């Protein structure tokens, strides 16, 4: 097991809508998965076939959680929309969003300059050979996460491709960094599969668990995530 670390920053702003006209503050790992699968199909890579597999259970993408001037990731504030890093507060929040009115199109973005965590957890080392190639393409051109990729919104640039290994969590009690798939969890989560080869945009809805919640689970390996805490 290993992971590729990164201080992924935004060249142009990203627009990710949620339900209830909510715009997400930071970019999520689902968006990274959806973009990297387009990369692997576009470069005729084999893992693209696994990219259209939503339960491959290797190459799991952790959320692009924002990084602070404290050098640490903003830990998500428990049961709250905004985030707060363990060192100081520096609290992210909505102020970073801007209401956009552009040619009829009224939407929102999140501004550029803030840095976000790259963390691609990979299990199979055979997949790491293609993983080095896809992080090496982004290294040259960039990745686009958001809406209006063809208009140019969402351009991301890595500044630190680091393939440093890691180990899973220890405590059973873990904090939910990202929203987790837990049935009858009363926190509705929506994403989609596009399947551009065969069309049929999906808009898959679910009722998983929300982020910022301490939960005890001995059967935990750590799209939810496990914070060691």
Partner RNA sequence: GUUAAAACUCUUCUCAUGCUGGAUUCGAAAUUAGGUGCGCUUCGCGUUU
Give residues in contact with RNA (CB under 7 A): 16-19, 22, 30-31, 33-38, 40-41, 48, 51-52, 101-105, 144-151, 154, 190-197, 201, 203
Tokens of 139: 């290294």
CB of 73 to Zn ion, least distance (A): 10
Contact partner, 68, from RNA, Zn ion, none, Cβ < 5-8 Å per class? Zn ion
CB of 37 to RNA, least distance (A): 2
Told to check if 90 binds Zn ion by CB under 5 A, we report yes
CB of 7 to RNA, least distance (A): 19
Give the whole-angstrom CA distance, residue 112 versus residue 108: 13
Choice from 42, 80, 87, 192 touching Zn ion (CB under 5 A): 87
Question: Which is closer to RNA, CB of 123 or CB of 193?
Answer: 193
Which range touches Zn ion (CB under 5 A), out of 22-30, 82-90, 110-118, 138-146? 82-90
Contact partner, 101, from RNA, Zn ion, none, Cβ < 5-8 Å per class? RNA
Tokens of 28: 């999520």
CB of 200 to RNA, least distance (A): 9
Residue closest to 25 by CA, chosen among 88, 96, 85: 96
Are 10 and 155 contacting, i.e. CB atoms less than 8 angstroms apart? yes
Residue closest to 225 by CA, chosen among 102, 119, 101: 119
Question: Which is closer to Zn ion, CB of 66 or CB of 224?
Answer: 66
Which range touches Zn ion (CB under 5 A), out of 85-93, 134-142, 180-188, 202-210? 85-93
Residues 1-20, buried b or exposed e (16+ Cβ, 10 A)? Answer: eebbbbbbbbebbbbbeeee
Cα 210-53-7 angle, rounded to 5 deg: 60
Cα 6-90-144 angle, rounded to 5 deg: 35
Grouping H, G, I as helix, E, B as strand and the rest as coil, residue 2 is strand
Contact partner, 88, from Zn ion, RNA, none, Cβ < 5-8 Å per class? Zn ion
Are 1 and 122 contacting, i.e. CB atoms less than 8 angstroms apart? yes
Residue list 124-183, contact with Zn ion (CB under 5 A): none
Phi/psi of residue 137, each to 5°? Answer: -75, -50
Told to check if 68 binds Zn ion by CB under 5 A, we report yes
Question: Which is closer to RNA, CB of 164 or CB of 203?
Answer: 203
Residues at the site binding Zn ion, with contacts judged by CB under 5 A: 68, 70, 85, 87-88, 90
């Amino acid at each position: 097991m290993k992971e590729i670390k990164g201080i992924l920053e935004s060249i142009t702003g990203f627009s990710i809508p949620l339900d209830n006209g909510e715009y997400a503050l930071y970019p999520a790992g689902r968006h990274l998965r959806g973009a990297i699968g387009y990369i692997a199909f576009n470069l005729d890579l084999p893992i693209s076939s696994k990219f259209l597999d939503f339960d491959f259970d290797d190459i799991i993408f952790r959320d692009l959680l924002p990084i602070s001037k404290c050098g640490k990731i903003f830990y998500p504030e428990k049961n709250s929309n905004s985030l707060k890093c363990p060192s100081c507060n520096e609290i992210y929040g909505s102020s970073v969003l801007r209401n956009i009115m552009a040619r009829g199109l009224s939407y929102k973005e999140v501004i550029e300059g803030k840095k976000y965590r790259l963390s691609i957890i990979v299990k199979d080392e055979k997949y790491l050979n293609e993983m080095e190639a896809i992080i090496r393409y982004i290294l040259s051109y960039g990745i686009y996460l958001g809406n209006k990729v063809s208009k140019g919104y969402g351009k991301f640039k890595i500044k630190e491709y680091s393939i440093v290994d890691i180990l899973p969590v220890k405590d059973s009690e873990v904090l939910l960094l990202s929203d987790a798939i837990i049935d009858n969890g009363e926190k509705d989560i929506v994403f989609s599969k596009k399947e551009i080869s065969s069309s049929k945009f999906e808009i898959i809805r679910k009722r998983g668990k929300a982020k910022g919640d301490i939960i005890r689970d001995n059967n935990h390996n750590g799209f939810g995530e496990i914070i060691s805490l």
